[PDB]
Amino acid sequence: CSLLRLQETLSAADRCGAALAGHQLIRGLGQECVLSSSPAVLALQTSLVFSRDFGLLVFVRKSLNSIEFRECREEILKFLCIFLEKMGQKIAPYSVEIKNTCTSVYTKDRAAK
Amino acid sequence: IHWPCRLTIGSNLSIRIAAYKSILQERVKKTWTVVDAKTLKKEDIQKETVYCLNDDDETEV
Amino acid sequence: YSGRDSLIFLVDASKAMFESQSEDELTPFDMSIQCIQSVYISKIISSDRDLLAVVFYGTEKDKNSVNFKNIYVLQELDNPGAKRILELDQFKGQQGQKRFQDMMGHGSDYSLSEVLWVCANLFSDVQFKMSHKRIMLFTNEDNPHGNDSAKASRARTKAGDLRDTGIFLDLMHLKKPGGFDISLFYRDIISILRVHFEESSKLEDLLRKVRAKETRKRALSRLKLKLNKDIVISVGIYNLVQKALKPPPIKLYRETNEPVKTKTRTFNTSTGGLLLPSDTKRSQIYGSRQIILEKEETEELKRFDDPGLMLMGFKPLVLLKKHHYLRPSLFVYPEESLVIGSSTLFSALLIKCLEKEVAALCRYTPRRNIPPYFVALVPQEEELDDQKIQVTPPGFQLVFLPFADDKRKMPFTEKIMATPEQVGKMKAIVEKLRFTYRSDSFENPVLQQHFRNLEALALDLMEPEQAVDLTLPKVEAMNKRLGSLVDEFKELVYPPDYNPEG
DNA sequence: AATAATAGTTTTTAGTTTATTGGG
DNA sequence: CTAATAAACTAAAAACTATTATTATG
């Protein structure tokens, strides 16, 4: 869907480490922030799977103090924080996996920054 | 402590010297030794520096 | 803080850049090449924070966003790294310009409006606070666009508008067997005589690599001088001199060049687990007892007065000893932000202490966690050079005073006079060895060697540039200007068989 | 529906490491 | 019959811009 196609576009645009990549990535992140914030239950599951895939992708791929990845990562963090504001216990499968993902986010370059 | 040396004049003259430091800001003679708070000992205070890569879960270097 | 400097470099790609009245002299292309390499090295040494770009015209192959034909940009506005130096040194040399001609175009029509447009766009791309707009062309003929009157008119209109926007273009005189005349196509399209057959545009200093470093208008510290207890003066304390050294070892992994996290850790010898800040006591075992204490009161003993200045009084400058010198002198400038109206007061006190030659002795505390020392304040007036530019700022030269325990003892020395003939002998010696002082002529040869080594290894040179040891006298001219004075003074003072040693 | 501390960059910097003499 | 001593060496704390939530208003 729209979430998936934006996931693919942002999965592409980070191919290069450059300011334009970070700009496009954070712009698309804001777009998805205002998009998937709408209360959904069918697009919610699609958002769940795309979020899992692309969160792994950015954690293992952005993963750099370069601002074209750092600003996008922190925007992702803000969006997921305001998203757990409204998702309930649906993280029950995502709970431990994203716990490990996030603590590894910290222990990696995010510790250096 | 003086500076027993030789001032030199170009390549044809040199005279020994005993230099002295008139103005010499006084320092602290003893630093605050980091003793334990349980046994009051530096010996209980052992330290190390860990060079580990700032990423990859702090890969040891 | 003030803005940065934008240095724009742009050379022609034609046969004029590749030719000379004498090919032994490096062609305009290659001459521009050592100019840009030298200014890149100088910027790396001094101001390796601003942004520098490389772009070409005349090349029949172009590469730019606007797609202006024959306008090919090489490097964006960038800090000069070793990558740029090496990728410009390949074309350095008369063989390198042939490689340039092969893999890069050379010789084609172009419009100055095109390069003005692309450079304006490139400057539009930057995202930093900016102060200097400097564009440095590289060409050896003024006419080629005055030939096309429409081209000349639109180019000068664009350049005038750009300089209205602050875009400041500087002409570079370039060698041409036909000349590079001014006031023909120049002095009317450049914001600021000889036909400039030569290439003198201060290019000598542009090739003069600078081993200097200073920050951009950085404030050291601003303090507030309390007069007695309530009347306070805002003052800016600054230096015209500050110690410099080689950059500290930037630790990095020998297998990734990645700076390895250097985290230290004190831990319990009893357990091996980390020592908390509570677990550690400050100790100084005087005599037989271990005095246990902590950090807060330790610094509360280190600190004794608030950040500021506490005036002691006024005294004529004669009341200080020449050997009395604690730490290197600083400068004080009036500050009109925290206390306004202290500029009138500063001028009044400056003049009045000039009249009576009374120094302002003051109890001074720069910040917290530091003892209040005693400082002498002498009026440091404004000194105007030939062009009336202040070479000595108006204000106060602040001189620092040691303490009784801060002065070591001197064993008693004999004062055994010398005959006036010996005095005249060394007077002649020194008059022969007399010259003026200038601190820009003195350096640390060890530091210069460090800089040159770091460059040449980053430049991948076969040999480092050699630092000049100006801290050693020239023995030839030395003995030339001494002659018989040395041994004459010897026999006057020292026995011929008795050297000053042994 | 606006303003106001406020952390993020440099700048020394007091203890720290080397050793080099000066005794003993 | 072993001995300070700058020096280069770290830390290390503070000043220097410098944005940026934040009531007040609705």
**Domain layout of chain C by residue ranges:** 4-214, 215-242+306-403, 243-305, 404-498
Whether A70 contacts chain B with CB within 8 A: no
Whether A107 contacts chain B with CB within 8 A: yes
Distance from CA of B28 to the nearest CA of C (A): 11
Residue with tokens 């001189």, as numbered in its chain: C399
Q: Residue type at C421?
A: E
Give the method of determination: cryo-EM
Whether A104 contacts chain B with CB within 8 A: yes
Whole-number Å distance between alpha carbons of C69 and C237: 54
Answer yes or no: do B47 and C267 touch at CB < 8 A: yes
CA distances from C251 to A66, B49, C48, C255, C264 (A): 20, 13, 20, 12, 14
Answer yes or no: do B55 and A104 touch at CB < 8 A: no
Distance from CA of A113 to the nearest CA of B (A): 10
Instruction: Please list every residue in chain C whose beta carbon sits closer than 8 Å to the beta carbon of residue B30.
Output: 284, 286
Whole-number Å distance between alpha carbons of C177 and C166: 34
**How many helices (DSSP H) and strands (DSSP E) are in chain A?**
6, 0
Q: How far is the CA of C359 from the C1' of E15 (A)?
A: 28
Positive or negative: CA dihedral C145, C148, C149, C154: negative
Tell me whether strands B45-53 and C130-138 are parallel, antiparallel or unpaired: unpaired
In eight-state DSSP terms, residue C176 is: -
- Residue by residue, DSSP assigns C26-52 as PPHHHHHHHHHHHHHHHHHHHHTTSEE
For residue C284, give the chain B residue with the closest CA.
B32
CA distances from C370 to C329, C366, C367, C407, C434 (A): 18, 7, 6, 20, 43
Residue environment code for A57-85, b if the CB has 16+ CB neighbours within 10 A, otherwise e = bbbeebbbebebbbbbbebbeebbeeeee
Whole-number Å distance between alpha carbons of C156 and C150: 10
Q: What angle do CA C485, C489, C495 make, to 5 degrees?
A: 135
The two three-digit tokens of residue C378, written as one number: 């002498």
Nearest Cα to Cα of residue B25 among C376, C403, C365, C243 = C403
Whole-number Å distance between alpha carbons of C189 and A3: 55
Please name the helix (run of DSSP H) or strand (run of DSSP E) that holds residue C453, with its range, or none: helix C445-458
Instruction: Please list every residue in chain B whose beta carbon sits closer than 8 Å to the beta carbon of residue A110.
Output: none
Whole-number Å distance between alpha carbons of A49 and C207: 60
CB contacts under 8 A, C 119-138 vs B, are: none
Of the residues B50, B52, B53, B54, the best mutation for testing chain A's interface (the one with the most A CB atoms within 10 Å of its CB) is B54
Tell me whether strands C4-12 and C51-57 are parallel, antiparallel or unpaired: parallel
Please name the helix (run of DSSP H) or strand (run of DSSP E) that holds residue C358, with its range, or none: strand C358-365
CA distances from C183 to C119, C180, C248, C363, C458 (A): 24, 10, 51, 61, 43
Q: How far is the CA of C248 from the C1' of E9 (A)?
A: 10
Answer yes or no: do A107 and B58 touch at CB < 8 A: yes
Nearest Cα to Cα of residue C330 among C220, C412, C409, C431 = C220
CATH number (1.10.3720.10, 4.10.970.10, 1.10.287.470, 1.10.490.10) of C243-305 reads 4.10.970.10
In eight-state DSSP terms, residue C417 is: -
Sequence-distant (≥ 6) Cβ neighbours of residue C417 within 8 angstroms: none
The two three-digit tokens of residue A82, written as one number: 């305001």
Whole-number Å distance between alpha carbons of C25 and C13: 18
Across the strands, what pairs with C398? C330, C377
In eight-state DSSP terms, residue C319 is: G
CA distances from C181 to C96, C189, C193, C238 (A): 29, 13, 8, 46
Backbone angles phi, psi at C131, to 5 degrees: -130, -35
Residue with tokens 């004029």, as numbered in its chain: C16
Q: Which of residues 367-386 of C touch strand E (CB under 7 A)?
A: 367-369
The answer to whether C226 and C307 have CB atoms below 8 angstroms apart is no
Q: How far is CA C128 from the centre of its chain?
A: 22
- Residue C238 has, within 13 A of its CA and on its CB side, a CA count of 15
Whole-number Å distance between alpha carbons of C453 and C464: 5
CB contacts under 8 A, C 302-331 vs B, are: 323-327
Whether B58 contacts chain A with CB within 8 A: yes
Whole-number Å distance between alpha carbons of C363 and C309: 6
Whole-number Å distance between alpha carbons of C112 and C15: 18
**What are the strands of the beta sheet with C289-293, ordered from one edge?**
B33-36, C280-286, C289-293
Q: What angle do CA C208, C209, C211 make, to 5 degrees?
A: 130
Q: How far is the CA of A18 from the C1' of E21 (A)?
A: 30
Q: How far is CA A81 from the centre of its chain?
A: 11
Q: How far is the CA of C234 from the C1' of E16 (A)?
A: 17
Of the residues B6, B7, B29, B35, the best mutation for testing chain C's interface (the one with the most C CB atoms within 10 Å of its CB) is B35
The two three-digit tokens of residue C403, written as one number: 């303490």
Sequence-distant (≥ 6) Cβ neighbours of residue C14 within 8 angstroms: C58, C106, C107, C108
In eight-state DSSP terms, residue B60 is: B
Q: Residue type at C19?
A: E
The two three-digit tokens of residue A32, written as one number: 């998805």
The CATH number of the domain covering residues in C4-214: 3.40.50.410
The answer to whether C41 and C53 have CB atoms below 8 angstroms apart is no
Whole-number Å distance between alpha carbons of C198 and A48: 71
The answer to whether C305 and B3 have CB atoms below 8 angstroms apart is no
The two three-digit tokens of residue C168, written as one number: 């400041």
**Residues lining strand D, beta carbon within 7 angstroms:** B 1-4, 27-28, 31-32; C 49, 215, 218, 220, 239, 242-243, 370
For residue B11, give the chain C residue with the closest CA.
C475
Across the strands, what pairs with C407? B23
Answer yes or no: do C486 and B13 touch at CB < 8 A: yes
C448: left (phi over 0), alpha (psi -120 to 50) or beta: alpha
The answer to whether C100 and C108 have CB atoms below 8 angstroms apart is no
In eight-state DSSP terms, residue C246 is: P
Sequence-distant (≥ 6) Cβ neighbours of residue A40 within 8 angstroms: A47
Whether B32 contacts chain C with CB within 8 A: yes
Sequence-distant (≥ 6) Cβ neighbours of residue C371 within 8 angstroms: C302, C303, C304, C305, C365
- Identify the three-state secondary structure at position B44: coil
The answer to whether A29 and A21 have CB atoms below 8 angstroms apart is no
For residue C256, give the chain B residue with the closest CA.
B53
Of the residues C251, C280, C298, the best mutation for testing chain B's interface (the one with the most B CB atoms within 10 Å of its CB) is C280
- With contact defined as 3+ CB pairs under 8 Å, the chains touching A are B
Backbone angles phi, psi at C121, to 5 degrees: -65, -45
**What are the strands of the beta sheet with C130-138, ordered from one edge?**
C71-78, C51-57, C4-12, C130-138, C168-170
**Contact pairs from chain B to chain C, CB under 8 Å:** 140
Helices within C127-247 (DSSP H only) = 149-164, 203-207
Whole-number Å distance between alpha carbons of C450 and C277: 40
The CATH number of the domain covering residues in C215-242+306-403: 2.40.290.10
Q: What dihedral do alpha carbons C15, C19, C20, C26 form, nearest 10°?
A: 130
Bases of chain E within 7 A of a CB of the protein: 4-6, 9-11, 13-19
Residue environment code for C362-390, b if the CB has 16+ CB neighbours within 10 A, otherwise e = bbbbbeeeeebbebbbbbbeeeeeeeeee
For residue B15, give the chain C residue with the closest CA.
C500
The domain defined by C404-498 folds into Ku70; Chain: A; domain 4 (1.10.1600)
Of the residues C281, C480, C482, the best mutation for testing chain B's interface (the one with the most B CB atoms within 10 Å of its CB) is C281
The answer to whether C316 and C356 have CB atoms below 8 angstroms apart is yes
The answer to whether C486 and B13 have CB atoms below 8 angstroms apart is yes
Q: Is the CB of C317 under 7 A from strand E?
A: no
